[PDB]
Specification:
binds zinc ion, Neutral Protease, domain 2, 2 domains, five-stranded mixed beta sheet, alpha+beta, 316 residues, six-stranded mixed beta sheet, binds calcium ion, metalloendopeptidase activity, 7 helices, Elastase, domain 1, binds beta-D-xylopyranose, globular
Length: 316
């Protein structure tokens, strides 16, 4: 819509107050004009018709429980934008300032959120498995990273390629969570998963075995479910990414940590330059060793740490 850019105030899913960019035209719409071609949040109104109605508010205040999923979807979409722009100099997910559109209140009791190829889609959860998933910045950035992947490497969503595809979204989903720097960690979905249970999450990058996911190539899932365990085998790469950043000893392999910033630089360059739709774990290693060589030199510590981390998880 066409209106005056305004700044509203509201509370997200977890009750945290935050400002959001709005557009005023009789009503205050969730339309952020300060980022690329805009960020738009829509109300699906408990139906599956997308995108729905552009979220309108009467007083520019978003403190109602019904607003909370829209606030976080709108706000965190902007944080993800600020991350890729400021850190990797990428304008939106496509690199050409494409508009980031999101729909909340999708269906009823929907325990999922996903990028549909054109926009984000956030369900409200059932209240026991999930609360509104937009409340998890890592989930938001996770799914928005799938768009970046599609507009670059195009990794398929099956077998090892899909595990990489999932690991890329967990890595940058976690890096965006650190970029926001409110309650960062190396878990996924902890903020919205099982509200009645504390200290758990969907999966752990620091210790994938915590939830039965593999932390080594020899333990990779080989079945047919989950498109070949894309969410399961991703732990092997998540463990590698965690070791590259924070370092540590794993299966007797010592890894020197180089930090989160370089981890993002190494993996962002590997995704945008060297990965192909059918990249496997071994080719990802080569993609990360080449990226670190470009950025820091073949003899640099960063290249060594990358090799160490993939050696630790058994990816040669
Ligand atoms: O999971 C924890 C990790 O986040 C921290 O960085 O180091 C100790 C681990 O227990
Ligand atoms: O110790 C882990 C256990 O907590 C989990 O239930 O299943 C996988 C094991 O590695
Ligand atoms: O043979 C593998 C070993 O090299 C590694 O250290 O841990 C897992 C084993 O399967
Ligand atoms: O069965 C596949 C396995 O061979 C590969 O190693 O990782 C993905 C699985 O789907
Ligand atoms: Ca209001
Ligand atoms: Ca997290
Ligand atoms: Ca929980
Ligand atoms: Zn994913
Ligand atoms: Zn967190
Ligand atoms: Zn998923």
């Amino acid at each position: 819509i066409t209106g005056t850019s305004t700044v509203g105030v509201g509370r997200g899913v977890l009750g945290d107050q935050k400002n959001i960019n709005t557009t005023y035209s009789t009503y205050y719409y969730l339309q952020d004009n300060t980022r690329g071609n805009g960020i738009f949040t829509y109300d699906a109104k408990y139906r599956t018709t997308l995108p729905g109605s552009l979220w309108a508010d009467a007083d520019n205040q978003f403190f109602a429980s019904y607003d909370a999923p829209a606030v976080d979807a709108h706000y965190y979409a902007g944080v993800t934008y600020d991350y890729y722009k400021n850190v990797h100099n990428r304008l939106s997910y496509d690199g050409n300032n494409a508009a980031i559109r999101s729909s909340v209140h999708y269906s009823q009791g929907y325990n999922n959120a996903f990028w549909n190829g054109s926009q984000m889609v956030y369900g409200d959860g059932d209240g026991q498995t999930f609360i509104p998933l937009s409340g998890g910045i890592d989930v938001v950035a996770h799914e928005l990273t799938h768009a970046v992947t599609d507009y670059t490497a195009g990794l398929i969503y099956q077998n090892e390629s899909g595990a990489i595809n999932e690991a890329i979204s967990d890595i940058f989903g976690t890096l965006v969570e650190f970029y926001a720097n409110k309650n960062p960690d190396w878990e996924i979905g902890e903020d919205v998963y099982t509200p009645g249970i504390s200290g758990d999450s969907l999966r752990s990058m620091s210790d994938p075995a915590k939830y039965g996911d593999p932390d080594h190539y020899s333990k990779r899932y080989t079945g047919t479910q989950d498109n070949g365990g894309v969410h399961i085998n991703s732990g092997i790469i998540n463990k590698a990414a965690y070791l590259i950043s924070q370092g540590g000893t794993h299966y007797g392999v010592s890894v020197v940590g180089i930090g989160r910033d370089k981890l993002g630089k190494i993996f962002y360059r590997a995704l945008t330059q060297y990965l192909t739709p059918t990249s496997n774990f071994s080719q990802l290693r080569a993609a990360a060793v080449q990226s670190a060589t470009d950025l820091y030199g073949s003899t640099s510590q960063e290249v060594a740490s990358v090799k160490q981390a993939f050696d630790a998880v058994g990816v040669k």
